[PDB]
Amino acid sequence: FPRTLKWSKMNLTYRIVNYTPDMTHSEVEKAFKKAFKVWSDVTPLNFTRLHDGIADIMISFGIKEHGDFYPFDGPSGLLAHAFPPGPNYGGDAHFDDDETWTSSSKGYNLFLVAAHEFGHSLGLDHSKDPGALMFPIYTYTGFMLPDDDVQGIQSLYGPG
Numbered sequence: 001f002p003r004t005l006k007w008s009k010m011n012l013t014y015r016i017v018n019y020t021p022d023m024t025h026s027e028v029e030k031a032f033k034k035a036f037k038v039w040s041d042v043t044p045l046n047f048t049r050l051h052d053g054i055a056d057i058m059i060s061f062g063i064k065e066h067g068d069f070y071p072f073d074g075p076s077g078l079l080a081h082a083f084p085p086g087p088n089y090g091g092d093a094h095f096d097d098d099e100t101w102t103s104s105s106k107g108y109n110l111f112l113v114a115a116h117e118f119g120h121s122l123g124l125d126h127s128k129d130p131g132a133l134m135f136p137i138y139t140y141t142g143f144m145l146p147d148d149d150v151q152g153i154q155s156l157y158g159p160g
């Protein structure tokens with residue numbers, strides 16, 4: 001307790017509030033869209049992007065103290081966090097812009113980190129399977145959602 005939790009609805013919205021200097025707008029948008037599709041492809045979840053106003057999953061880049069009780073720490077250490085399902089900060093995902101975000105093998109691959117963090121946004125906890133997306137340690141192995149993660153998200157939301 002309290003490891004997992006699910007949204008009471010499956011039509012979810014998201015908003016990209018701001019953009020990292022590290023990547024182009026298009027690269028950031030592609031990364032987040034692909035990261036949501038990881039989860040919608042195997043469940044009844046569907047994700048719609050909003051360009052303004054409140055969305056369920058608010059996405060932002062920030063440094064140090066950025067508006068919650070979970071400050072970032074400069075280069076290294078923490079790279080991102082996401083709140084469990086619920087109102088207000090619930091579901092929101094924050095990325096530490098004192099890290100280097102990429103669409104490549106350098107730095108942290110934004111797609112891979114976002115896909116993991118959106119798992120947390122949807123109520124998943126970590127896996128003990130080193131091959132799982134939800135494993136606690138970041139690696140870059142070169143995308144198909146591993147079966148451990150498929151089982152985890154389908155146990156909350158059912159299959160697609």
Ligand SMILES: CC(C)[C@H](NS(=O)(=O)c1ccc(-c2ccc(CSc3nc4c(c(=O)[nH]3)CCC4)cc2)cc1)C(=O)O
Pocket residue numbers: 077078079080081082112113116117120131132133134135136137138139140141142144146
């Ligand atoms: C609980 C908080 C404190 C923590 N924040 S953090 O900054 O310490 C943090 C640490 C690690 C991660 C991360 C990102 C991507 C991954 C998959 S990497 C990966 N996965 C897969 C493949 C791959 O190549 N790489 C192939 C299939 C699955 C694994 C861990 C994110 C954030 C957290 O959010 O977990």
Ligand SMILES: [Ca+2]
Pocket residue numbers: 072073074075076077078079096098099
């Ligand atoms: Ca950091």
Ligand SMILES: [Ca+2]
Pocket residue numbers: 055056057058086087088089090091092
């Ligand atoms: Ca929210």
Ligand SMILES: [Ca+2]
Pocket residue numbers: 020021022096097098099100101
């Ligand atoms: Ca950066």
Ligand SMILES: [Zn+2]
Pocket residue numbers: 066068070071081094
């Ligand atoms: Zn935060």
Ligand SMILES: [Zn+2]
Pocket residue numbers: 116120126134135136
């Ligand atoms: Zn995690």
